[PDB]
Ligand binder design. Sequence first.
Ligand SMILES: Cc1cn([C@H]2C[C@H](OP(=O)(O)O)[C@@H](COP(=O)(O)O)O2)c(=O)[nH]c1=O
Ligand SMILES: [Ca+2]
Length: 129
Amino acid sequence: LHKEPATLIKAIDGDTVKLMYKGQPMTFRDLLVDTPEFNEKYGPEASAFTKKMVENAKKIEVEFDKGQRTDKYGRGLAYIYADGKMVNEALVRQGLAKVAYVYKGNNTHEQLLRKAEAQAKKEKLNIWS
Ligand SMILES: Cc1cn([C@H]2C[C@H](OP(=O)(O)O)[C@@H](COP(=O)(O)O)O2)c(=O)[nH]c1=O
Ligand SMILES: [Ca+2]
């Protein structure tokens, strides 16, 4: 896979962010994870964690997987990086997202993220507390 440039337009919630990609505004949904909705337990914490990560980054990048790049709602589907650190993984490692929505052929980082989730669960972090 390849990292590509993007710029932050606006934080949205734990697993979605508005980015400018190839010069066009888009909503991106993070591959392979599910954060709680803002209205649910840990939802506010997941949103604040993603907000800080993307706002503080000097460089945002997106990395598409091998399969579909947009979902049925028109959201980009990608791994999002903030100064080289994957947001998707960092949420899972902190117990602020579960590994989820693992569709065959857009799942390159699945085992990396499942290892992060095992660690968060062993630490009883957040959703796993
Ligand atoms: C993460 C992901 C979500 N989706 C769709 C499945 C879910 O459909 P439904 O809306 O019908 O439940 C929805 C979950 O997104 P949210 O967790 O953002 O609600 O997004 C994909 O199609 N591909 C993906 O890789
Ligand atoms: Ca969600």
